[PDB]
Amino acid sequence: MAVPPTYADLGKSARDVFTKGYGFGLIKLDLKTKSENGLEFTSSGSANTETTKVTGSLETKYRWTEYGLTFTEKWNTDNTLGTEITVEDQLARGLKLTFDSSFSPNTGKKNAKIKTGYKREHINLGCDMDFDIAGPSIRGALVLGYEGWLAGYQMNFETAKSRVTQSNFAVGYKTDEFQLHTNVNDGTEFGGSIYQKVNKKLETAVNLAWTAGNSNTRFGIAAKYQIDPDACFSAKVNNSSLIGLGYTQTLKPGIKLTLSALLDGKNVNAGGHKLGLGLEFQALE
């Protein structure tokens, strides 16, 4: 059983480029300190320095053994409450148990979800059940792996009703320089993502999806261009003429500067620019 993170290859390309990147002109912060002693500490969030609009999250995390125990506690300023604790089973190799807590906006009480992952040498099985008091929802995930092609489908069955609430789908193939994954988010958005590497130049990813309702094609391309070990520029544009770039610059061992800006080609000069300035601090050594 040599089972790679195939489920993770379904959205690694897509999630990064698909995200809008709507910066309100504010500051993003991230600080992560790792120790291989069960300790992981993360501080993250965004603050608008124009008056005082600070919303973020604080993560108290526990990391014991790389492929063993990971405890995640996080609380958002939005009052939402997130928990995810993962334990890898040593008897059943490829068996992953994680206990999740869903982050309640108004309730303030975290809610219990049970997340299970079984890896078979060709395909990945995942059972995730969110327990609501009036009607729990059980979502089943299956990632398929067959010579050259990688596939996935995650379905949400709502026992609160008689019905599926979310339908997620993934298909594609992996090649030396090209990775393609067709991804579906509900019946409402279905499209494909292409990951292409330009040797020693830059790396580009394409995401475009069709959204049910009208004949809309959503097209977007992102490329991360690295010239320096301490400097890498990542730019993406969406077919809505929206150009957003993020510049990652390392200022000495421990400080990452991330400049991000979405320029609405619709009329940035008179319509406004989207801005995100982010500092990422890390303690490893």
Instruction: Report the binding-site residues for ATP.
Output: 12, 20
Backbone angles phi, psi at 9, to 5 degrees: -85, -10
3-state secondary structure (DSSP) of residue 6 = helix
Can you give the C-alpha Rg of the chain in angstroms? 20
Distance CA 77, CA 47 (A): 11
Backbone angles phi, psi at 106, to 5 degrees: -105, -30
Q: Are 262 and 24 in contact (CB under 8 A)?
A: no
Annotated binding site: 12, 20, 242-244, 260-264
Distance CA 259, CA 248 (A): 7
Q: Are 126 and 147 in contact (CB under 8 A)?
A: no
Distance CA 148, CA 25 (A): 43
Report the 10 Å Cβ neighbour count for 46: 20
Report the 10 Å Cβ neighbour count for 76: 16
Alpha helices in the chain (DSSP H): 6-9, 12-18, 268-271
Annotated binding site for NAD(+): 242-244, 260-264
